[PDB]
Design a protein around this ligand. Sequence first.
Ligand SMILES: *[C@@H]1O[C@H](CO)[C@@H](O)[C@H](O)[C@H]1NC(C)=O
Ligand SMILES: *[C@@H]1O[C@H](CO)[C@@H](O)[C@H](O)[C@H]1NC(C)=O
Lengths: 73, 73
Amino acid sequence: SKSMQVPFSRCCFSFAEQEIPLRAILCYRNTSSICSNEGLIFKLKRGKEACALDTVGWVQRHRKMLRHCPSKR
Amino acid sequence: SKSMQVPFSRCCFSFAEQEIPLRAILCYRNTSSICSNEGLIFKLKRGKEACALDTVGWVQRHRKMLRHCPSKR
Ligand SMILES: *[C@@H]1O[C@H](CO)[C@@H](O)[C@H](O)[C@H]1NC(C)=O
Ligand SMILES: *[C@@H]1O[C@H](CO)[C@@H](O)[C@H](O)[C@H]1NC(C)=O
């Protein structure tokens, strides 16, 4: 287990205004706890991503319909 | 070009204390301009990464010896 690592944080400072369709989303990532701010990250198709604010209804409803994104190692 | 996207920011709030060997690094990523803080991200082997503070000598010397990380699309 190679760990010279001090990872970067994934933060959401700007958020999706327009509702993203559920069909367009693969999974979600939670933002880093240091810069949390109730943001969520939806993994879209072809490598794309979108920050979404979890205090908004459609974000909560979508989050409840998707699993957390998996990671490599 | 699918863009429903509002990307997350890559930030560096904690930094590498111990110097990472140049041989262990593939390239570097600059942090997002919103949360810049003079941090740098070094891409390590087997998917790993490390935040490094660009006001420190070894970080500046290493940065000058590596190219910027490429991206998919
Ligand atoms: C995701 O955010 C929720 C709050 O909405 C929190 O309870 C949880 O610990 C976070 N999970 C991860 C895996 O970061
Ligand atoms: C990287 O940081 C330098 C300052 O050290 C800045 O001049 C530059 O605009 C940044 N480049 C990118 C590609 O983010």
